[PDB]
Amino acid sequence: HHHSSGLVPRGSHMANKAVNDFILAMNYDKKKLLTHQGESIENRFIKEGNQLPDEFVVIERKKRSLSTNTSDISVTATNDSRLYPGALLVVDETLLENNPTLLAVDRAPMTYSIDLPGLASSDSFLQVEDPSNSSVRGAVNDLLAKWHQDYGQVNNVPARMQYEKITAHSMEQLKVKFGSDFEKTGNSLDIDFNSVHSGEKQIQIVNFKQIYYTVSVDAVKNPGDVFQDTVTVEDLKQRGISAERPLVYISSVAYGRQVYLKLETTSKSDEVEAAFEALIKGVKVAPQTEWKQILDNTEVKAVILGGDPSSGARVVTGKVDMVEDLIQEGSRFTADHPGLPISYTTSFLRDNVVATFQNSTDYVETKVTAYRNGDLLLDHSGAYVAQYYITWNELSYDHQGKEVLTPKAWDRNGQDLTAHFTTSIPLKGNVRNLSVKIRECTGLAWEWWRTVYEKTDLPLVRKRTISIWGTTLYPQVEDKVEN
Ligand SMILES: OC[C@H]1O[C@H](O)[C@@H](O)[C@@H](O)[C@@H]1O
Ligand SMILES: OC[C@H]1O[C@H](O)[C@@H](O)[C@@H](O)[C@@H]1O
């Protein structure tokens, strides 16, 4: 097969065979090529207390790490010309970053299969003579319009739903969860991370993928097979291809609609998970209780990557009312609109093993505990002098995370008071060891003062009215709580 000149003729099968041998000969570490380790910052943390309007919150810190390992690459962009089934990609830092470098060299014909419901055998294959985003998308769209006319109109299809959620802490941890390129849509979601670590909010992120169809490509027998005879080893080298920087092809793409949902509540109820969940499922088993209180304190921002004209709606549907709306909009697929790429997978060209990526990060999980403010009300309408001795500790946290309890005492402590006297003592959630003592002067020489109330560590509640009344010999007291 050798040519007299000793050259390898561009465009000959010998050219393509050298390419095939070039790739087959590459040795590399799949593990090390596709691995990212974030930052190992696993120090020790400080305990802290934060007073805010209607409550006191203690912020505890715990040590967690998030690790992911998947062959599935989620798509953010809406019109990426690099992301078509069969596309050749380079394995780079840029592939890990979901911003890949495409290898646009002369492509050989390729055959694809779509897995659309109600579609037979031979009608599920598409032949694409010169694979590119345009030509492959053009091929499926043709088929879709056909399918649309003898199924998707008639039959409710519907779509394949995949739900996935997490509690937002860092952008970095959101990246390991949803993809290296999540920052774009995370930044559109307005995720107030500040107020998460500062106790003021709890945020969760949920991803809804609705899959209309998937198109994919059979394993390739020879690495050579994807190139025209015009492509040569020199060309691959000119474009930086080597063992150190080998290549994958995308072996399937999932098309449909996908939404990202930010559920942001003010309620530190650290029992938000269920109230968010029931809102997702839309089960509505008596929304006028505890779950209702927190769902009424939920802001919602959503980024939608629909089956519609390719662009992302960034809408802030505001209230949780318009969440069922979203899970419903792309529910059925009729083939009136081909959805867009929602996720894709890649396989090494050398040998077809699917490339799985490995991401990790350490992040700070912040637990939040809320102690609500209350008021202590006092009512004195007895025919006697009384004195109160009201006492407590206000709790705070010093750098070093130790418990600081500084003692306090009501100002009018010890004063004689007579009827009718009423006051109202605001007690913030950081108060501990409440003591209330009330004595009354009976006028008896032998029992000058009688204590009519004496409690310690009086539980802080939203509302406590201690009323006293009656006479010097028959005082009456009521300890009324309201929560
Ligand atoms: O505590 C002072 C007390 O003095 C008398 O009892 C009345 O003038 C009351 O209304 C007042 O509350
Ligand atoms: O010595 C205690 C004395 O304090 C005040 O002067 C009055 O309230 C008296 O009635 C009370 O008994």
Q: What are phi and psi of 207, to 5 degrees?
A: -110, 125
Domains in the chain with CATH codes: 1-372 (no CATH), 373-483 (2.60.40.1430)
Ligand nearest to the CA of 386: 2
What's the residue count for the chain? Answer: 483
Q: Are strands 357-372 and 35-37 parallel, antiparallel or unpaired?
A: parallel
CA distance 339 to 141: 10
The finding on whether 419 has its CB within 6 A of some atom of ligand 1 is yes
Helices (H) and strands (E) in the chain, counts: 11, 22
The finding on whether 441 has its CB within 6 A of some atom of ligand 2 is yes
The finding on whether 417 has its CB within 6 A of some atom of ligand 1 is yes
* Number of the ligand 2 atom closest to the C-alpha atom of 448: 12
Amino acid (1-letter code) at residue 79? N
Q: Using most ligand atoms within 8 A of CB, pick from 416, 439, 440, 447 the residue to mutate for ligand 2.
A: 416
- What one-character DSSP code corresponds to residue 118? T
CA of 435 to the centre of ligand 2 (A): 22
**Type and span of the H or E element at 364:** strand 357-372
CA distance 417 to 379: 11
Structure tokens at 114: 């779509």
CA distance 170 to 411: 45
Structure tokens at 116: 């659309």
CA distance 187 to 194: 14
In sign, the C-alpha dihedral spanning 465, 470, 471, 475 is: negative
CA of 78 to the centre of ligand 1 (A): 75
Residue whose CA is at the smallest distance from ligand 2 atom 11 = 441
Q: What are phi and psi of 238, to 5 degrees?
A: -65, -35
Cα-Cα-Cα-Cα torsion 87, 90, 91, 93, nearest 10 degrees, comes to: -110
CA distance 304 to 100: 23
- Closest to 205 measured CA to CA, from 173, 249, 157, 242: 173
Structural biology method used: X-ray
CA distance 42 to 194: 20
Q: Which residues contact 360 (CB under 8 A, 6 or more apart)?
A: 36, 37, 38, 65, 66, 67, 68, 176
Question: Are the beta carbons of 39 and 361 closer than 8 angstroms?
Answer: yes
Question: Are the beta carbons of 342 and 254 closer than 8 angstroms?
Answer: yes
Resolution in A: 2.5
CA distance 92 to 390: 69
The dihedral region occupied by 400, where left means phi > 0, alpha psi between -120 and 50, and beta the remainder, is: left
- Closest to 367 measured CA to CA, from 9, 59, 4, 132: 59
CA of 419 to the centre of ligand 1 (A): 5
Q: Which residues contact 191 (CB under 8 A, 6 or more apart)?
A: 168, 171, 174, 203, 205, 262, 264
The finding on whether 416 has its CB within 6 A of some atom of ligand 2 is yes
**Sheet strand arrangement including 402-409:** 402-409, 386-398, 431-441, 449-456
Cβ–Cβ contacts within 10 Å for residue 67, how many?
A: 12
Ligand nearest to the CA of 416: 2
In sign, the C-alpha dihedral spanning 254, 259, 262, 263 is: negative
Q: What are phi and psi of 477, to 5 degrees?
A: -140, 145
